[PDB]
Amino acid sequence: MVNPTVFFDIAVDGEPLGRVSFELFADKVPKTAENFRALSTGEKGFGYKGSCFHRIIPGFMCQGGDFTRHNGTGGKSIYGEKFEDENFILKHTGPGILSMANAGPNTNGSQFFICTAKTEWLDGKHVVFGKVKEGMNIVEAMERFGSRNGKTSKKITIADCGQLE
Numbered sequence: 001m002v003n004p005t006v007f008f009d010i011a012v013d014g015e016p017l018g019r020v021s022f023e024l025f026a027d028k029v030p031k032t033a034e035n036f037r038a039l040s041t042g043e044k045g046f047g048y049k050g051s052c053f054h055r056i057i058p059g060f061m062c063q064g065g066d067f068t069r070h071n072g073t074g075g076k077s078i079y080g081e082k083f084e085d086e087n088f089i090l091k092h093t094g095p096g097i098l099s100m101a102n103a104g105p106n107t108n109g110s111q112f113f114i115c116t117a118k119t120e121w122l123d124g125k126h127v128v129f130g131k132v133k134e135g136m137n138i139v140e141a142m143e144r145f146g147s148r149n150g151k152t153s154k155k156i157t158i159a160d161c162g163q164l165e
C-alpha cells in the first residue's frame with residue numbers, strides 16, 4: 001500500500017498563489033486519511049474545493065475545511081456529521097503537520113489544521129494524519145495573511161484540490 005498524496009491549489013482574494021501537497025498517513029490512520037482524501041477529490045459529492053482558511057494564526061497554525069458554514073462552525077465527514085478519534089499514534093512535531101480540528105472527544109468532521117509551529121500540547125487530543133510534502137513555502141505565504149486573533153486580511157481559498165497519487 002502507498003500513502004496517498006493530495007494537493008490544494010491556494011488562492012488569495014481569488015489570485016493564484018501556489019500548490020501545497022500532503023502525504024496522508026493511511027498506514028497509521030486509514031479512516032482519518034480516507035476522509036481527507038475523499039473530501040479533497042470531492043468524489044462523494046462534497047468537499048474542500050472552494051472553501052477557505054477561516055483562521056490563520058502566524059506562528060501557530062492555519063485552519064480550514066468548513067465547507068458548510070464557511071466560518072469554522074460547520075463541516076461534515078464522509079462518514080456522517082462526526083466520526084471518532086481513530087488513534088493518537090502521531091504527534092504534533094513541528095511545522096507542516098496536518099491534524100484534525102475538533103470540538104471535544106470523537107467529534108471529527110471535515111475541519112483540519114496545518115501546523116506552522118510545534119504544537120505538542122495538542123498531542124493526544126487532535127488526530128494527526130498527514131504532513132505537508134511540498135509547498136511549505138506556500139503555507140508560509142498564507143501565514144502572512146493571518147493575524148494574532150486568526151482573522152485573515154485577504155480571503156485564502158482552496159481554488160482546486162485533488163489527488164496526485
Ligand SMILES: CC(C)[C@@H]1OC(=O)C(C)(C)/C=C/c2ccc3ccc(nc3c2)[C@@H](C)NC(=O)[C@@H]2CCCN(N2)C(=O)[C@H](C)NC1=O
Pocket residue numbers: 055061063072073074100101102103111112113150
Ligand atoms: C472544528 C470546529 C467545529 C471547532 O469549533 C469549536 O469548537 C467552536 C465552534 C466552539 C469554536 C471554537 C474556537 C473558536 C475560535 C478560536 C480561536 C482561537 C483558538 N481556538 C478557537 C476555538 C485557539 C486557542 N486554538 C485554535 O485555533 C485551535 C488549533 C487546532 C485546531 N482547532 N483550533 C480546533 O480544533 C478548535 C479547538 N475547534 C474548532 O475550531
